[PDB]
Amino acid sequence: ERILVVKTEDFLKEFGEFEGFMRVNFEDFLNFLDQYGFFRERDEAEYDETTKQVIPYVVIMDGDRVLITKRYSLGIGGHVREGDGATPREAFLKGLEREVNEEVDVSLRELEFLGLINSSTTEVSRVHLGALFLGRGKFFSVKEKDLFEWELIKLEELEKFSGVMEGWSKISAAVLLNLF
Amino acid sequence: ERILVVKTEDFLKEFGEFEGFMRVNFEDFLNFLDQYGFFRERDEAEYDETTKQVIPYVVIMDGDRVLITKRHNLYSLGIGGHVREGDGATPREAFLKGLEREVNEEVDVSLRELEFLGLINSSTTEVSRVHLGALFLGRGKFFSVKEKDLFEWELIKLEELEKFSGVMEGWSKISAAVLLNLF
């Protein structure tokens, strides 16, 4: 499984040093992936902070409710695979679609890029770069019952729930609440 | 007490939208203060998200140890305060003296470099949403806290800071993450 990465060094040169979330221009991010993105074996990428794995991270909203899942997580993330597209930008956009459709049955109406998530507080977060989207649509079901439980919570309740969340979910909760 | 503030619209225009910490150039920031900074009554800024109160926020390191303080009482990392109108003739001048004053009111230290690291902008609390943090690392000799009946302190090794960051909140937690990544 070869997956999409960028050199952390190139990421830092292009977007600067930040911890948490930062809004960026989507065109600029896609241009960045085409210029600096490459593919590596997941087994070598997982432990090597030389690179950051590019992770589309989609928060699903159905009306005024946001989907949260437990194995709580606010976003649905996955890797971008070499086979997902001819170029890093194409692979990214197709992985975004595939990634979400693996976990849930949803009819998306619009997907909005919000920005990037970069955090350094765990071994795993240090080897990941998140591309945060808000996916507005109709939620039908989760694809695998033995993998995930789900809840659809109102934004009024997200304030409460984000206290029991960690990492990217916590950051994404803060961003979503501030946006609305 | 009239204190240094900026309009949120001016802040977002200059620095954009972020949640957490972002590195910025110190000169650019000070220029930003001179261009957009002004002073307003403190009590009347607490209830207003139209403006952000500029808070110098200094993490102190003595050798390879970092200062943690504690007045539920969380451990905290960083000493902050408001910049007062009487600290200087301009926003930049008031900031720089207020930065020094702010720290000296809380602790007895002798600091080499104040290294400006960047800005903290978090929206997770009422106080957070009206505060803009200017994060510095001050390296020096730490002697004591000014008010020993208001705070306890500990100097912890940097390899212990990850543990403490796990139980801290707010700007302390963010600042711990920034410092650990710098090292």
What SS3 string covers chain B? CEEEEEEHHHHHHHHCCEEEEEECCHHHHHHHHHHHCEEEECCCCCCCCCEEEEEEEEEEEECCEEEEEECCCCCECCEECCCEHHHCCCHHHHHHHHHHHHHHHHEEEEEEEEEEEEEEECCCCHHHHCEEEEEEEEEEEEEEECCCCCCEEEEEEHHHHHHHHCCCCHHHHHHHHHHHHHC
How open is the CA angle A41-A47-A48, to the nearest 5 degrees? 80
Minimal CA separation from B122 to chain A, in Å: 8
Please provide the DSSP assignment of A152-172 as one string: EEEHHHHHHHGGG--HHHHHH
CB A45 within 8 A of CB A51: yes
CB A102 within 8 A of CB A80: no
| B20 backbone φψ class: left, alpha, beta (φ>0; ψ -120 to 50) | left
Mutate to test the interface with A, among B11, B14, B18 (most CBs of A within 10 A): B18
Q: What's the rounded Cα separation, in Å, for the pair A73 and A75?
A: 6
Other CB atoms within 10 Å distance of the CB of residue A7: 14
- CB burial of B114-138 (b: ≥16 within 10 Å; e: otherwise) equals bebbbbbbbbbeeebebbbbbbbbb
Which 3 state secondary structure label does DSSP give A147?
A: coil
User: What is the enclosing helix (H) or strand (E) of A179?
Assistant: helix A167-179
User: In whole angstroms, how far apart are CA B124 and each of A170, B63, B130?
Assistant: 10, 33, 11
Closest CA to B68 of B133, B134, B164: B164
- CB burial of A81-110 (b: ≥16 within 10 Å; e: otherwise) equals beebbeebbebbbbbbeebbeebbebebee
Q: Which fold has domain B1-183?
A: Nucleoside Triphosphate Pyrophosphohydrolase (3.90.79)
Breaks in chain B (C to N over 2.5 Å), named by the residue before each, are: 71
User: What is the experimental resolution, given in Å to one decimal place?
Assistant: 1.9
Which 3 state secondary structure label does DSSP give A7?
A: strand
- Among A119, A120, A174, the residue with its CB nearest the CB of B124 is A174
Please provide the DSSP assignment of A87-146 as one string: SHHHHHHHHHHHHHHHHEEEEEEEEEEEEEEE--SSHHHHTEEEEEEEEEEEEEEES-TT
Q: What's the rounded Cα separation, in Å, for the pair B9 and B50?
A: 8
CB B34 within 8 A of CB B92: yes
Tokens linked to B111: 């600091």
Instruction: For chain A, give the number of residues.
Output: 180
Which 3 state secondary structure label does DSSP give A21?
A: strand
User: What is the enclosing helix (H) or strand (E) of A35?
Assistant: helix A26-36
- Among B17, B19, B22, the residue with its CB nearest the CB of A16 is B22
Q: What's the rounded Cα separation, in Å, for the pair A134 and A128?
A: 19
CB A56 within 8 A of CB A129: no
| B118 backbone φψ class: left, alpha, beta (φ>0; ψ -120 to 50) | left
CB B5 within 8 A of CB B94: no
| CB < 8 Å to B21, chain A | 18-20
Q: Please, which residues bridge with residue B176 across strands?
A: none
| CB < 8 Å to A20, chain B | 18-21, 122, 174
Mutate to test the interface with A, among B17, B49, B174 (most CBs of A within 10 A): B17
- Among A16, A120, A178, the residue with its CB nearest the CB of B177 is A120
CB B39 within 8 A of CB B87: no
Beta-sheet pairing, B79-80 with B18-23 = unpaired
Q: What's the rounded Cα separation, in Å, for the pair A135 and B167?
A: 33
Q: Which fold has domain A1-180?
A: Nucleoside Triphosphate Pyrophosphohydrolase (3.90.79)
Q: Please, which residues bridge with residue A141 across strands?
A: A105
Q: How determined?
A: X-ray
**Chain B interface with A: residues with Cβ < 8 Å:** 16-23, 118, 122-124, 165, 174, 177-178, 180-181
Instruction: For chain B, give the number of residues.
Output: 183
| CB < 8 Å to B11, chain A | none
Per DSSP, A17 falls in state -
User: What is the enclosing helix (H) or strand (E) of A34?
Assistant: helix A26-36
Q: What's the rounded Cα separation, in Å, for the pair B79 and A59?
A: 35
Q: Token match 């997982």: residue?
A: A46
- Among B19, B118, B178, the residue with its CB nearest the CB of A171 is B19
